[PDB]
Design a binder for this molecule. Structure first.
Ligand SMILES: Cc1ncc(COP(=O)(O)O)c(C=O)c1O
Ligand SMILES: Cc1ncc(COP(=O)(O)O)c(C=O)c1O
Lengths: 277, 277
């Protein structure tokens, strides 16, 4: 297919990464994932704003305007003829002779983007999934969506080995987020989720869902809950651009209530469907 | 020059990294740096053991024996005719379609190694350097020498901006290590340094310096000290493969004792000089 490589869309075969690309040596870069439904990009400007905010937090200056980036992404979906699936794209600080401090010569960032045809997870949204708790050993700036993803790679592998779809992370028993999702709990019609500070990533699906909840007039409290309280909830689900609102029906052998998708989760999925192209 | 690419030494321009190399998308790999003095690799068996141990802690299986690995490093130094400088080499989990969990299939690890000419930092050892305190925000598995180095590049940039050579990190008021070195304080003829647990990397120069202290009968206490205690030390210095024993004579505008390199730091540097090729 075709890959975005800085500001060109080339055949896949044509892109080559340097060994001293700082993204390969220090994970020094940021990224995003955008879902495409029937050829249209969902919340693409929101994701581009978060890419440039992640980049500013670690002082990378992306060399293109945000509107040029949106057009390049539109081009990439066309050439690859993507119908339903996603676009992955990342930015690294550039390739420079290995050193920890920023390149003294101003080097240009390297941008890579490509598509994958991938249907909606309908069986999971319908039936729900199993999850497991994992201690959060990640760094303290989880608000940046960076390529330093080793804490999340090891947590998701632990989950996959226990036959679970996702790992719910926690710092001394306060649930923060999932290895690649935000985590919500429902108790007595109220929506709970961890506040967006440096302990979590402020997910765009998370904020779409908090908006959907204000639209069905469901109260939202952004206060953290524990692993113990998570197990006492009436309903639980995880959110991300690729898993949408995926019900969690069981954690570590314990059923969440009766092991069935709850009523408020079905109400939030129906409201989320009105936002899809 | 020539680069080691998996088990072949090829010309630098032949090496191609893939955009779905897990080292590029997740920082999912481990690395080592080995100093070479006058064509001779210093403590190369200790660095290879620490590479295989870092790879095991995150379950990457290196496909070669330590002995084939040692031969490959040796060929690399002579193909490049390196006199004094260093070898850098890293291993990643491999190229696989992007997903956080390990390849369910079986993928081979990608190995990269290359050299850089670089003389000893003699002015620093003689004169000493300035340092700054920076809070440690890194993940909790700092005992693994992994490619997730973004907390360290940000600390090192901050130090460089203040005109300092190194950032001394501290977590809960306690000095842990530098962004790319270990830290030692001397008071009343006793050597102090933080214990090697998950908060620091157990540096190979750290262990060579502790051996120097044993040989000249200087007491070593592997006990944590606070930043205020650090400022009250009679002497201070930092260690790493490329900076050896660099005296620290000032931190954030406050002199360590008289601001001159101390007596015991000098007799530790004399002892280190007898270990060197
Ligand atoms: C660590 C982390 N938290 C939360 C999320 C959810 O973000 P989004 O809804 O923007 O995809 C993700 C993205 O997958 C993530 O990687
Ligand atoms: C974080 C950190 N601590 C300590 C060290 C010093 O270790 P060594 O003596 O093995 O080079 C390093 C070396 O790169 C390092 O990156």
């Amino acid at each position: 297919g075709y890959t975005l490589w800085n500001d060109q869309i080339v055949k896949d075969e044509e892109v080559k990464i340097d060994k001293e690309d700082r993204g390969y040596q220090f994970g020094d870069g940021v990224y995003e994932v955008v879902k495409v439904y029937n050829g249209e990009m969902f919340t693409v400007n929101e994701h581009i704003d978060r890419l440039y905010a992640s980049a500013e937090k670690i002082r990378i200056t992306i060399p293109y305007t945000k509107d040029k980036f949106h057009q390049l992404l539109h081009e990439l979906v066309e050439k690859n003829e993507l119908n339903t699936g996603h676009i992955y794209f990342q930015v690294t600080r550039g390739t420079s002779p290995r050193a920890h401090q920023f390149p003294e010569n101003t080097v240009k960032p390297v941008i890579i983007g490509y598509t994958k045809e991938n249907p909606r997870p309908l069986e999971n949204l319908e039936k729900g999934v199993k999850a497991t708790f994992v201690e959060d050993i990640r760094w303290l700036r989880c608000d940046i969506k960076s390529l330093n993803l080793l804490g999340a790679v090891l947590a998701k592998q632990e989950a996959h080995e226990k036959g679970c779809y996702e790992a719910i992370l926690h710092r001394n028993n306060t649930v923060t987020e999932g290895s690649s999702s935000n985590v919500f709990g429902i108790k007595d019609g109220i929506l709970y989720t961890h506040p967006a500070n440096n302990m979590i990533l402020k997910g765009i699906t998370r904020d779409v869902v908090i908006a959907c909840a204000n639209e069905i007039n469901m109260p939202v409290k952004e206060i953290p809950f524990t692993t113990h309280e998570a197990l006492k909830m009436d309903e639980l689900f995880v959110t991300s651009t690729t898993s949408e609102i995926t019900p969690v029906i069981e954690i570590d052998g314990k059923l969440i209530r009766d092991g069935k998708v709850g009523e408020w989760t079905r109400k939030l999925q129906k409201q989320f469907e009105t936002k899809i192209p």
